[PDB]
Amino acid sequence: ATSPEGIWSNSGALTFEDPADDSEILFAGVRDVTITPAYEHAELYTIDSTFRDEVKRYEHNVNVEITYAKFSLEFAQEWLGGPGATATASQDDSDPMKFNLENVTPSASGGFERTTAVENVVFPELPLDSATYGEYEEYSLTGSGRSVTNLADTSG
Amino acid sequence: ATSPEGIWSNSGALTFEDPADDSEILFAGVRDVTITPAYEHAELYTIDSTFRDEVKRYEHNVNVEITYAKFSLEFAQEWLGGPGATATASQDDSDPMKFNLENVTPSASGGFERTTAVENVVFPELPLDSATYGEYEEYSLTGSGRSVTNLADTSG
Amino acid sequence: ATSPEGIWSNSGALTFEDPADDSEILFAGVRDVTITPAYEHAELYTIDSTFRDEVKRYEHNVNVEITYAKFSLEFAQEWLGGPGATATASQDDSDPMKFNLENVTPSASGGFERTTAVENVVFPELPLDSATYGEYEEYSLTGSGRSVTNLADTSG
Amino acid sequence: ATSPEGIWSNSGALTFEDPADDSEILFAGVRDVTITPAYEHAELYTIDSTFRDEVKRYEHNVNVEITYAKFSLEFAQEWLGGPGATATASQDDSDPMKFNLENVTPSASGGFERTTAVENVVFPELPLDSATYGEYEEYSLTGSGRSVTNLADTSG
Amino acid sequence: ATSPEGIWSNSGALTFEDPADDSEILFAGVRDVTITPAYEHAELYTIDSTFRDEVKRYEHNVNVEITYAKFSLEFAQEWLGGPGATATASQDDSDPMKFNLENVTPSASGGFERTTAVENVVFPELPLDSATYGEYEEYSLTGSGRSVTNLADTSG
Amino acid sequence: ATSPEGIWSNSGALTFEDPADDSEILFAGVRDVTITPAYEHAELYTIDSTFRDEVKRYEHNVNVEITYAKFSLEFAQEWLGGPGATATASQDDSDPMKFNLENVTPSASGGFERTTAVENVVFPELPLDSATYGEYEEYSLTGSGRSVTNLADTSG
Amino acid sequence: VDATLSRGGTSVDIPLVEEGGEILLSSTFGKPEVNVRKSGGSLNPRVIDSWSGLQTFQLVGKLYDYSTSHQLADLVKTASTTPLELQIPQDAYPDTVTVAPAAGQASALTLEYPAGRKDLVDVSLSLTRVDPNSVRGVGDQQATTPTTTGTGPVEVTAGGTTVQLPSSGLSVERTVGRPNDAVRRVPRQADPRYEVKAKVTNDVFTFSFETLDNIPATLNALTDNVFREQLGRDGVTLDFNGLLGLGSVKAIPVGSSPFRQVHQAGRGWVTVPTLEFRRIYSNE
Amino acid sequence: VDATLSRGGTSVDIPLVEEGGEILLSSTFGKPEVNVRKSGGSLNPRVIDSWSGLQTFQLVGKLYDYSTSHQLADLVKTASTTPLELQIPQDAYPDTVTVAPAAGQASALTLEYPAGRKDLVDVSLSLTRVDPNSVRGVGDQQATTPTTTGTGPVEVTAGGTTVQLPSSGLSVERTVGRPNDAVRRVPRQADPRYEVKAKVTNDVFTFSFETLDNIPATLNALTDNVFREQLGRDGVTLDFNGLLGLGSVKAIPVGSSPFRQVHQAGRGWVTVPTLEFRRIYSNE
Amino acid sequence: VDATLSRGGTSVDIPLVEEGGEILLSSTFGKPEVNVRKSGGSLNPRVIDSWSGLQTFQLVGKLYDYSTSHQLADLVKTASTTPLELQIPQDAYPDTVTVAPAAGQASALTLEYPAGRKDLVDVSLSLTRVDPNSVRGVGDQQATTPTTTGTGPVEVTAGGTTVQLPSSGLSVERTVGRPNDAVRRVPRQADPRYEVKAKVTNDVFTFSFETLDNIPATLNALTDNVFREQLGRDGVTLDFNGLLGLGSVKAIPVGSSPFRQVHQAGRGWVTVPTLEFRRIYSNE
User: Nearest CA of chain F to the CA of B56: how many Å?
Assistant: First the structure.
């Protein structure tokens, strides 16, 4: 097995890809990233006991939230356009833009390269403008992916 | 495609227009400006999987919220008067003053000039007086536009 | 039109008047003054569009809240007594004391004199004693007016 | 009428009385004192207007809350014992101890002496012990009186 | 009567006892100690009046919460075991460990010795490990006693 | 019985075990660690008393929450893979990974070695990436164990 | 925006528009008329299908003017063998369908005038689908809702005596229906036959309000003259005096507890949770 | 504070008092006896009004002693030719009115003893208005609620076997009514005629509680001897043992599902959501 | 952990386990069959006890595989002269009791397959106690639930046309019962007699789902063939296609409103809150 090791946020590289083509969507200037797979847990008790008897996973998702400080035209125009099309204005249709996401992080002392990938991430809300006096525009995304497609050491 | 770039809030250029005319309503002195198109997300599951099957966008709105420090009589009398009308007191009618809205910002190294525009923003409540001892009056507007009409690089 | 301009809180003059007579009720020493006309908004969505179709104002009020640091016997005794009568004890009757309110401010560079006025302001709760160790008694009012009766430049 | 004036908290003079006797219960050492008569407001709207038609008061009370730093065995044993009785333990009965209350504050420039008095204040909960490391015990009481019996200038 | 007097938290002495035997359960190193006898109050209002007409106590309890920084094996093993028995693992039975509690404090200038005692205190949750980086383990209890069995001056 | 004593967080020694083997899962670099056995409390009153008549424990659990700063691929791949299996991606199944857990803490003066152990801890959610700009990734886990298997002095 | 409901040349367009994620249109289907076997030594029933089933449209909307609402109420309530025609804009339904006010319903249309919401009328509709050629019945009778400009207080008026309903909190729910028409199964195509009966319609006004002054005098003047005494073959005149643009109408309370007076803890005045009337004959 | 209900010289004063904005006195009116037309080739029906209407008073309050509650239950349940007389303090009602326990209801009075309260009983009442002279009857029959000092556990007792109801969580809801009295319409008076029938009354005790030890033994001793055994012409003796100042009474379970045992996730003990009895004859 | 239910040699063990503090087993008792002296001539009724009472067990649980759920449904629905035998694992009940699917119930078993929740079936059961020797019946008839491996989309197939039910948000509630058996009171013994009747059983499938694309084509192809044509003596074939391991079954809509389309404000697609089918004959 591989020892646990520290990870330094500023070493990470995040990428967004179009799930139709695996072409990159230009995105940069990340500050914070949380990627958290989750399941709702049903935690089941009997008649005969005060203790738990069984516990079961059900609704799975991956919570993705990102804070970033370089605006991308492409990321926003793809989110407006929806799957497989790019737009300069809100679209009156029900399909959200699905993004694939990968985050790559060398560990702090070079023990491993933790690569995480997530499929079909979608964002209910896109901050277009996030202006504050005397500050750079800082944008926060909250969204949900369908599953974690990869979690592995990608070092040699 | 155009490279992502930082944006500096003090480069902003918010304006309000009467959507009947496409004429400017005098407004100035912003200190915070948020624009966020948002669709409600339905996430959907099957009878025999933990994973999400599908996700769909439903109710759409553009959340607009603005904090500003120069009072405008014109903007306030438009909000009081409602569509196409100016009034100096509350009007007993069910039509809110719709505004069109635009914001224009060069990126921090001039790589692009992002223009955001929004149709038919309405504000539930208008702070007429927002006075605190030893401070200038600072006014907070929260509102909802119908759709983003434009999101593009307008640089020549 | 008139240019937007800054407003400095300490420049204001606030007054309460009896709506029966328009005589002044002695009140002074404010530190915060918030006046916010508000309407509940219904955002009506259509059968098939994700977009909003129409939006309607449906229930109007003016939120008034004031923080002040000079006690007034008169204001409190009128609030106890109810309309047209002044009292030194709680009254077992259903009518609240209606107040008319006007607030007047020169703008920060003398461009205009914003006068705001509000009819039939009422307060659910009145602080009588608001004592804190090593501080002056600071009193907070929260209440609701029926409508804004005036919003105009009262300069010559 | 008498001019409004500042009031200094440390000029205060809270006392509690047993309303069966009009005799003092030994209590002292206050640090915060709030007295607030209140009524619930029904705000009523018509079939045919966005404006409020009428407003009515219901369910009167006086919110009393006090923070203090000198413990009193008498006040606590009165609260435990309930009306007309002293007890050194919880009593199994449904009658709460009712206190009359008075506070007298000279205004900051001696313009008036504001006497507030309140009938049948009751406290749901009594903090017997409020120990914190390296601090004196500081006790917070919140309670409800029936009505304000007196609110007047008592200067001579 | 006896004058109110200050109390200094650090002068206190808390103890826990087994209600079966009145033998001590070894417990030490408290930092914060709150004891609050409480009741629900029903405030009863008539028809026609806006005022209250009666008020009544119900569902008495004594809220006890303690923060402490010396771990006790005995206290924890008694809480696991339940009444009259001591254990090293979770017990699958419905009886909580009832504790008797007494707290004793000289008043700050030696006027009285306030003794407070509470019967049948129980704690829904017991922290075992409360580790924080670079700090001692600090443990918080929240629980409810049945009644205050004593509140008196135990000085001569 | 053994005297109570302080415990210093940095003396701790958390470990996780696969409960199929009682074999270690590589995990390290904690910062904060809470273990709290709990039971839901029913407090039951009666028809002719304000006092609590009885109190009973029902649903038992052990709240475990851990904050840690060294990432473990093994622990995450166990959580993904579920009982008895390692996986590099989300698995479409309803069995959560169950961990056995132990923590060993000498007292501050060596009076005892408190060992806490917990069975079948499950975590609803598992942060994979927890990047914050200019910080090391810090990971929070909240989970529920079935029961405390051991709570004893293990010193020789 | 709008579905279109029409009869002959006369037509109303109804906005299928609502706050948030509320239901706007529901099409309900069923086969009440399958003859399922109740008996026989086999676990699962044998069945036969032989009749017109049931399709029903529920529509919800908001109307922005009173006159369009009154005209809808009249066009709904009217007796005519002229088929009532519905056009739905949403592509899941064909461009025209023939309907009738819901087969047995007391409240085939609801119109509501809640407190505050000037120029919002909430609307709920229920329509049974009927075969286009299978509308039948006796005569034509155009319904009327009287109108006036007066904009006065509503005056419950009986035995030469009047009580003004206090405007404070005053809210109206009005319901309309044709529960005495007959919809019948046919051994034919799936949509039933419909008979426009020369029989009584349903048309009910529900008020709620709070009486804020002269409370004893008001409540006695209302109760004695409307709920204690006998009205004969007359009824209460419910004079809207031009509120909502409605004119004078004649009506009576019907059924169990159509009027409630409520006295409350800590309140110095009386609530009217409902006061209800059914409209009556005044058509000579 | 109090409204007064009385029969003969005997009188009870009921505090119409509550927490929050709760209802304290609801007075409701209805004309069910209008002979509305179902027929005719006219849109709006003709009507005729020909009879006494319905007025009903609903009263809510809290009683501070058990004896006053028992005396009310006895004064309610009693059969007498003497009219039941209500005095209402609020000016919107005339100073005195004549009533009967509500005509269609099995629970004209509810008395509730929830856990954790003492000298505090919840009350709900329902009273149909009757014409003062239009009260008629057969004999007089005084109701008695037995009393004792014992302050012991409640003892459900049958076949000479007894079960103590565990005090933990124990909460009582008792309902009383005169559902066999006949109320009848009269053709030329505002208020109906009331016949005080020499027929059986309704008087039901409901419990909820949680059984905390000797649970299997308790639940079998309760279920066998009350719900599997046959009680004959006898019943359960429900010995209240001086709780609430109530004496012993004889009773039987009535209705489809009077008693429930509930076993729950994570609970090592059994809940009783209801155990119910109707009081039977013990008046020989 | 598990209660045991059996029908001859075949046996099923059911986990009585639930989230939080939910009800898991409820034992309900009553005496519907005591006779009450409705007149009496005195305040309190005389009574007589003469017949078998009613004991009913409600069980709630969760099943971890579909095969155990289908085998339970087949065991429940089967007609057999052999008594249905229950063992309850909690000491307040004896180690064996004889029962029948609940006396009058259409839904003696519910099986729920909610969205998400792979390898969780939620279960509710209702059973009436019967005397161990007092079970009788007209022959034996084994219920069957078809099974298959296909794991494809569910197809509503009718008149040789097919519609795939969209998996998006799809949730199944299946209900099973024996509402045509007869449970009868017996004199002077605790538990009733039970007759396994040669009559039709109940087996209803309910879907809820949302149709995301090809919406007009989907909804019309479904509704015309299922709700706006005659099926004859045939019905719909509901091809479960190996979902849950279920095979194809023949079925028809039953009740007034088995199917609903719902169109909502701001939604670009259609909700299907119900599509209900009752299973039919396919057993020649």
Answer: 22
User: How far apart (Å, rounded) are the C-alpha atoms in residues F46 and E58?
Assistant: 11
Chain D contact for E45 (CB, 8 A cutoff): yes
Bridge partners of residue C144, in order along the sequence: C63, C122
Question: H or E element: which one contains C81?
Answer: helix C73-81
In whole angstroms, what is the distance from residue F96 CA to residue F19 CA? Answer: 13
Q: Does the CB of D94 have a partner CB in chain H at under 8 Å? A: yes
Q: Is the C-alpha dihedral spanning A73, A76, A80, A82 positive or negative?
A: positive
Query: CA–CA distance from G199 to each of G137, G202, G252, H256 (Å)?
Result: 11, 10, 19, 43
- D touches I (3+ CB pairs < 8 Å)? no
Output the CA torsion G188→G192→G193→G197 (10° steps).
160
Contacts of G133 (CB under 8 A, 6+ apart): none
The whole-angstrom distance between residue G217's C-alpha and the CA centroid of its chain comes to 33
Q: Rounded to an integer, what distance in angstroms lies between the CA atom of residue D154 and that of residue G167?
A: 44
* Closest C-alpha among B11, B6, B17, B7 to residue B117: B17
A53 to chain H, closest Cα gap in Å: 9
Q: Which amino acid is at I41?
A: G
Cα gap G257→G278, rounded to integer Å: 13
Considering CB atoms only, which of F52, F116, F147 is closest to E128? Answer: F116
CA distance I49 to chain A (A): 34
Q: Which chains touch B (3 or more CB pairs under 8 A)?
A: A, C, D, F, G, I
Q: Alpha carbon of I132 to those of H222, I14, I81, I91: distances in Å?
A: 22, 22, 12, 20
Resolution (A): 3.0
Residues from chain E contacting residue A50 (CB–CB below 8 Å)? 92-94
Residue H75, phi then psi, degrees to nearest 5 = -65, -35
CA angle H98, H99, H101 (to 5 degrees): 165
Q: Which of D28, D76, D141, D140 is nearest to E6 (CA)?
A: D28
Strands H135-137 and H193-196, bridge-based pairing: parallel
B54 Cβ contact list (under 8 Å, min separation 6): B43, B44, I168, I169, I212
Q: B79, B88 in Cβ contact below 8 A?
A: no
Structure-token match 């003047």, residue found? G221
Cα torsion B67, B72, B77, B83: sign: negative
I104 has a chain H CB within 8 A of its CB: no
Distance CA F148, CA H195 (A): 70
CB contact under 8 A, C47 and G19: no
* CB-based contact G37:G46 (threshold 8 Å): yes
As a three-state string, the secondary structure of chain E is: CCCCEECEHHHCEEEEECCCCCCEECCCCEEEEEEEEEEEEEEEEECCCCCEEEEEEEEEEEEEEEEECEECHHHHHHHHHCCCCCCCCCCCCCCCCCEEEEEEEECCCCCCEEEEEEEEEECCECCCEEECCCCECCEEEEEEECEEEEEEECCC
Say yes or no for a CB contact (<8 Å) between E51 and C90.
Answer: yes
Cα Rg of chain F, angstroms: 19
> What is the rounded distance in angstroms from the CA atom of residue F35 to the CA atom of residue F96?
20
C82 contact residues in E (CB cutoff 8 A): none
- How far is B116 from B102, CA to CA, in rounded Å? 6
Best mutation target among E49, E50, E52 (most C Cβ atoms within 10 Å) is E50
Query: Cα B94 to chain center, whole Å?
Result: 21
Cβ-based contacts under 8 A for chains E and F: 143
Which experiment gave this structure? cryo-EM
Residue bearing tokens 């704690």: E123
Give the residue from I77, I81, I97, I79 showing the smallest Cα distance to I89.
I97
What does the buried/exposed string (b/e) look like for A2-26 if buried means 16 or more CB atoms within 10 Å of the residue's CB? eebbebbbeebebbbbbbeeeeebb
Token pair 């009077």: residue: H258
